Amino acid sequence: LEDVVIDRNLLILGKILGEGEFGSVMEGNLKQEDGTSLKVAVKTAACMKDFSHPNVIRLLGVCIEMSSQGIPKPMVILPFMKYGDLHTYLLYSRLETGPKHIPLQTLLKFMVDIALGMEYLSNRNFLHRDLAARNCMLRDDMTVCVADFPVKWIAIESLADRVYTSKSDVWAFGVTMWEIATRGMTPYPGVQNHEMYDYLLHGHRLKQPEDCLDELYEIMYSCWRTDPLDRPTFSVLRLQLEKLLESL
Numbered sequence: 050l051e052d053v054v055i056d057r058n059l060l061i062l063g064k065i066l067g068e069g070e071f072g073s074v075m076e077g078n079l080k081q082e083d084g085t086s087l088k089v090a091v092k093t094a095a096c097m098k099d100f101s102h103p104n105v106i107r108l109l110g111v112c113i114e115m116s117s118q119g120i121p122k123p124m125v126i127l128p129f130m131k132y133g134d135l136h137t138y139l140l141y142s143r144l145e146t147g148p149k150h151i152p153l154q155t156l157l158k159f160m161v162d163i164a165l166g167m168e169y170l171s172n173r174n175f176l177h178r179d180l181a182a183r184n185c186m187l188r189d190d191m192t193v194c195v196a197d198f199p200v201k202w203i204a205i206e207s208l209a210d211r212v213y214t215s216k217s218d219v220w221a222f223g224v225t226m227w228e229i230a231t232r233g234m235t236p237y238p239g240v241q242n243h244e245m246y247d248y249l250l251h252g253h254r255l256k257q258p259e260d261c262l263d264e265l266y267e268i269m270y271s272c273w274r275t276d277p278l279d280r281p282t283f284s285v286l287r288l289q290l291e292k293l294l295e296s297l
């Protein structure tokens with residue numbers, strides 16, 4: 050990975066934007082090769098840089114800092130998304146001052162973007178393992194891209210065993226569609242995490258939102274079929290969403 054590494058001097062770190070897993074995420078400035086500086090986010094691997102898709106977050110590079118004691122502390126440089134995560138954006142839209150009421154057309158486009166992003170990763174046999182609205186970021190052109198690659202998002206087979214495939218990502222995508230259609234509801238209202246396995250095992254699934262089209266609910270429902278092989282691929286789901294969108 051001698052290609053992805055960036056000189057520490059080219060990076061300036063600022064405030065903390067949020068906590069994530071095993072370390073804090075911070076704002077920063079990255080001086081580029083063209084002399085200009087770019088706003089970035091820094092998580093305090095080489096294959097991710099090979100990823101290239103407008104609906105997938107790009108790796109800008111990584112830096113390694115040596116602390117006063119010589120302890121190494123690696124840092125992952127990612128683009129700065131001022132509009133933030135999609136999950137939070139959906140909730141803000143429900144309030145005044147925040148963005149306007151997001152129409153169905155725009156909501157579907159969010160789903161398409163995510164489907165396009167996953168289609169790209171699925172073709173490279175890369176598993177996401179944590180797809181959710183909170184892990185989808187909004188770019189300055191208001192297009193969505195997947196990032197950050199949780200019991201209520203994990204597929205039924207992935208709970209029973211440690212088996213995980215693209216069909217598991219499809220399951221989580223179905224839930225993400227539901228978050229979007231409901232504008233940020235927590236999955237399975239009235240159901241607690243420790244009850245999820247028995248809840249799904251008994252055949253229960255996420256219920257249809259009030260103003261959600263039958264055609265749309267059919268798409269997301271197909272993601273939750275018990276047998277992973279019965280679930281459609283991302284390339285299928287993407288075209289279904291696209292056709293449904295153009296029909297409006």
Ligand SMILES: CCCCNc1ncc(C(=O)N(C)CCCC)c(N[C@H]2CC[C@H](O)CC2)n1
Nearest residue numbers: 066067068069074090128129130131132133196
């Ligand atoms: C998950 C991929 C990280 C992408 N980088 C990034 N960019 C911007 C923000 C952010 O929080 N902003 C602009 C504030 C929103 C104002 C509307 C950001 N936040 C992180 C998201 C993921 C979380 O684990 C830590 C905070 N990340």
Ligand SMILES: [Cl-]
Nearest residue numbers: 060061062063
């Ligand atoms: Cl710094």
Ligand SMILES: [Cl-]
Nearest residue numbers: 132133138141
């Ligand atoms: Cl916002």
Ligand SMILES: [Cl-]
Nearest residue numbers: 232233234235
């Ligand atoms: Cl809610």
Ligand SMILES: [Cl-]
Nearest residue numbers: 237238255256
């Ligand atoms: Cl539900």
Ligand SMILES: [Mg+2]
Nearest residue numbers: 069183184197
């Ligand atoms: Mg996260």
